């Protein structure tokens, strides 16, 4: 009856899955599948570029648009919730709208909103644009892995999906290289002037938007996954795509290129008035799929998969957010440690045309001597007085004056504002030709992370070959122990993250550990891909990735709620969870 009807139904589902796998291994493995791998790797490169941007290059935005210190955590948190909701929504949509269609829509949204963020001024608009780029990038992996799976035979599935993390890593490397090239240096970016405004921040975002636009440009050529066509009652285009597959694979290598007759013979043998209605129907289909993800068939497998994904989330956070946060903190303490105090600049009426930086005066006194050529770069005076020391066309940078006076001294073209100069004595302290207005200070602490960007660049670049080694190596272990190796990797990652106290040592160790961590993530990704049915592969993958992102953003929330004094408690929680989940959460079919 109904129960036996469903029994024969999923029996035929298994039969057709076997038949599709037979068709796939009949087509082969050649140029077409590697071209598709390169295109989906461009997509993963875009995803990695946005991950790097959000996790690494957030602290450079207070030089513009008046970014407050308390709202950086809010920006990161809301972008991670954007990635979460995007991953969940696009994963749910793909299995009832298309793997290529949803991937194209997500990449178009990401590219358009990244471009818009590159051309917005107010902080609110930039935050909104990054939030809506979050959904576009979060929708990538659940519709890249689960869409490249159906184009690969069983024997080559795990081996060739294990190499998709290399493109994520090279995307991180590309983003770091652009950051190092154009954010610090003023020779690569310049202000247009009257026609437009261009700081190194905008050019950085605009150039980081490029991998996404190339991915969407190259994604058009590849066709929709045949399995989706087969499941959605669409037969002719399935024949078309499979014919494209074997011909492209077999033109280079494969004797049957001469004639495909018998095999293709077997292949053919096998506006709210409607927009609102279709949106509601799509929502109903996605809700049905998500609810059936917790049915009697997958009541326990999905739960164990959740546990194994939670196992991984405490290394993804450490590599993506914890590492650059720690590097930034260490660079901050280093730049606080470095000092340059000038007691005075007394000279016998000799002009000083030389340029100096980091001038700080502590109780310095001037005997009413006029000095020409003084430079104010990274200058933070304290308890200092000036006597007729005015200079024409003086350049001001990082001017933070407090408890200091400038009696009978007038400066031109300075970044000083009313709020910058408070609680200090002043008489006739009026500055002419002042550049008052929107704060656009050059070298205004946005150039203070040059070493941070260089460290991130070389760390990721060196992770890349270690990642090559680890990815080439992990495929040797049997599939029953790749996730055990993942748990071991996470345990070692946490056992280090409980020990973070140095700069160069942390660079080297987190770099040589990025290889094993990233090579080990794809083992879990492959395990998630193979197990779930092709109808529910993308929902389940997106749902588990959404819980990985939820764990990451909850770690971010606690870390930003209590920072500095308490950092290692989440790592203790991580190690305890790893120990608890390595005992009985490895009985996965």
Ligand X SMILES: CCC[C@@H]1CC(=O)N([C@@H](CC)C(N)=O)C1
Residues that bind its own copies (CB under 8 A): 177, 337-338, 451, 454-455, 457-458, 461-462, 464-466, 468-470, 472-474, 476-477, 484-485, 487-489, 491-492, 494-496, 498-505, 507-509, 511-513, 516
* 401 interacts with, out of its own copies, ligand X, none, CB within 5 to 8 A per kind: none
Nearest-approach distance from CB 419 to its own copies, in angstroms: 30
Interface residue list for ligand X (CB under 6 A): 44, 141, 164-165, 168, 315-316, 319, 517-518, 521-522, 525, 545, 548
CB of 462 to ligand X, least distance (A): 14
Phi, psi of 341 (to 5 degrees): -110, 125
- Nearest-angstrom CA–CA distance, 14 and 149: 17
Which of the listed partners (ligand X, its own copies, none) does 165 bind, with a CB threshold of 5 to 8 Å by partner kind?
ligand X
Instruction: Tell me, letter by letter, the H, E, C secondary structure of 82-95.
Output: HHHHHHHHHHHHHH
Q: Please calculate the CA angle 176-203-417 and round it to the nearest 5 degrees.
A: 110
How many C-beta atoms lie closer than 10 Å to residue 467's C-beta?
A: 22
Contact yes or no for 205/118 (Cβ under 8 A): yes
Residue 554 beta carbon to ligand X: minimum distance, rounded to whole angstroms: 13
Tokens of 297: 């068939």
Torsion of CA 130, 132, 133, 136, to 10 degrees: 160
CA nearest to 543, candidates 318, 316, 292, 297: 292
Q: Which of ligand X, its own copies, none does residue 177 bind to, with CB < 5 to 8 Å depending on kind?
A: its own copies
User: Minimum Å distance from CB 13 to its own copies?
Assistant: 35
Binding site partner of 240, from its own copies, ligand X, none, Cβ cut-off 5-8 A by kind: none
User: 230 or 474: whose CB is closer to ligand X?
Assistant: 474
Compute the least distance from the CB of residue 17 to ligand X, in Å.
23
Q: Which is nearer to its own copies, 230 or 327 (CB)?
A: 327
Which residues in the chain precede a discontinuity of more than 2.5 Å between C and N? 270
Sign for the CA dihedral angle at 195, 197, 200, 204 comes to negative
Nearest CB to its own copies, comparing residues 304 and 462 = 462
Contacts of 16 (CB under 8 A, 6+ apart): 230
Between 181 and 546, CB nearer to ligand X: 546
By the 10 Å C-beta count (0-12 exposed, 13-18 middle, 19+ buried), 18 is classed as exposed
Looking at beta carbons only, is 107 or 455 nearer to its own copies?
455
- Cβ distance to its own copies smaller for residue 341 or 422: 341
Residue whose CB is less far from ligand X, 182 or 548: 548
Residue owning tokens 């029953």? 480
Minimum separation from the CB atom of position 203 to ligand X (A): 26
Which of 110/315 has CB closer to ligand X? 315
From the list 144, 160, 143, the residue with the least C-alpha distance to 152 is 160
> With b meaning 16 or more CB within 10 Å and e meaning fewer, what string describes 143-179?
bbbbbbbbbbbeeebbebbbbbbbbbbbbbbbbbbbb
Q: How far apart are CA 449 and CA 170, in angstroms?
A: 22
**DSSP-based three-state secondary structure for 495:** helix
**The entry of ligand X, its own copies, none that residue 507 binds, CB within 5 to 8 Å by partner kind:** its own copies
Residue 525 binding target from ligand X, its own copies, none, CB below 5 to 8 Å by type: ligand X
Which of its own copies, ligand X, none sits in contact with 44, Cβ below 5 to 8 A by type? ligand X
Which residue number, 76 or 448, has a Cβ lying nearer to ligand X? Answer: 76
Q: How far is the CB of 584 from its own copies (least distance, A)?
A: 17
Residue 334 C-beta: closest distance to its own copies, Å = 9
Tokens at 274, concatenated: 């409607």
The CB-of-506 to ligand X minimum distance in angstroms stands at 16
């Amino acid at each position: 009856p109904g129960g036996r009807g469903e029994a024969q139904r999923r029996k035929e589902r298994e039969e057709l899955a076997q038949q599709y796998e037979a068709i796939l291994r009949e087509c082969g493995h050649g140029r077409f599948q590697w071209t598709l791998y390169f295109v989906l790797g461009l997509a993963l490169m875009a995803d990695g570029v946005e991950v790097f941007v959000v996790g690494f290059v957030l602290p450079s935005a207070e030089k513009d648009m008046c970014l407050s210190d308390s709202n950086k955590g809010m920006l990161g948190l809301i972008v991670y919730l954007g990635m979460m909701v995007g991953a969940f929504l696009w994963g749910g949509l793909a299995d009832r709208l298309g793997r290529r269609q949803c991937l194209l829509i997500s990449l178009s949204v990401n590219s358009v909103f990244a471009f818009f963020s590159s051309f917005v001024q107010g902080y609110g608009t930039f935050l909104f644009c990054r939030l809506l780029s979050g959904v576009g990038i979060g929708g990538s992996i659940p519709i890249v892995f689960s869409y490249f799976s159906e184009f690969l035979a069983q024997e080559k599935r795990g081996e060739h999906l294990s190499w998709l993390c290399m493109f994520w890593m090279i995307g991180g490397v590309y983003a770091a290289a652009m950051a190092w090239a154009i954010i610090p240096h003023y020779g690569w970016s310049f202000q247009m002037g009257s026609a437009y405004q261009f700081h190194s921040w905008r050019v950085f975002v605009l150039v980081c938007a490029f991998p996404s636009v190339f991915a969407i440009g190259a994604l058009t050529t590849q066709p929709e996954s045949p399995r989706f066509f087969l499941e959605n009652g669409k037969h002719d285009e399935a024949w078309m795509v499979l014919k494209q597959v074997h011909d492209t694979n077999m033109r280079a290598k494969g004797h049957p290129e001469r004639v495909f007759s018998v095999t293709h013979i077997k292949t053919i043998h096998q506006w709210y008035q409607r927009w609102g209605v279709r949106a509601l129907s799509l929502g109903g289909q996605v809700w049905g799929n998500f609810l059936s993800c917790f049915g009697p068939e997958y009541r326990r497998i999905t739960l164990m998969m959740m546990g194994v994904w939670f196992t991984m989330s405490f290394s993804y956070y450490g590599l993506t957010v914890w590492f650059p946060d720690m590097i930034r903190h260490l660079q901050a303490v280093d730049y606080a440690s470095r000092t340059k105090v000038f007691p005075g600049e007394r000279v016998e009426h000799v002009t000083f045309n030389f340029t100096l930086e980091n001038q700080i005066h502590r109780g310095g006194q001037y005997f009413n001597d006029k000095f020409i050529g003084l430079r104010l770069k990274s200058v933070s005076f304290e308890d200092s007085l000036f006597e007729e020391c005015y200079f024409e066309d003086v350049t001001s940078s990082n001017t933070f004056f407090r408890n200091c006076t400038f009696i009978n001294t007038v400066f031109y073209n300075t970044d000083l504002f009313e709020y910058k100069f408070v609680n200090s004595r002043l008489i006739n302290s009026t500055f002419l030709h002042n550049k008052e207005g929107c704060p656009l200070d050059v070298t205004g602490t946005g150039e203070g992370a040059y070493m941070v960007y260089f460290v991130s660049f070389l760390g990721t670049l060196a992770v890349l070959p270690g990642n090559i080694v680890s990815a080439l190596l992990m495929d040797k272990i049997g599939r029953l122990r790749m996730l055990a190796g993942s748990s071991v990797m996470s345990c070692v990652s946490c056992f280090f993250l409980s020990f973070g106290n140095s700069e160069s040592a942390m660079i080297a160790l987190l770099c040589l550990f990025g290889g094993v961590s990233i090579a080990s993530w794809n083992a879990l990704d492959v395990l998630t891909v193979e197990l779930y049915p092709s109808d529910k592969r993308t929902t389940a993958f997106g749902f588990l990735n959404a819980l990985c992102k939820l764990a990451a953003v909850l770690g971010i929330s606690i870390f930003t709620s209590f920072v500095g004094i308490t950092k290692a408690a989440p790592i203790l929680f991580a190690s305890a969870a790893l120990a608890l989940g390595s005992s009985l959460a490895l009985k996965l079919p």
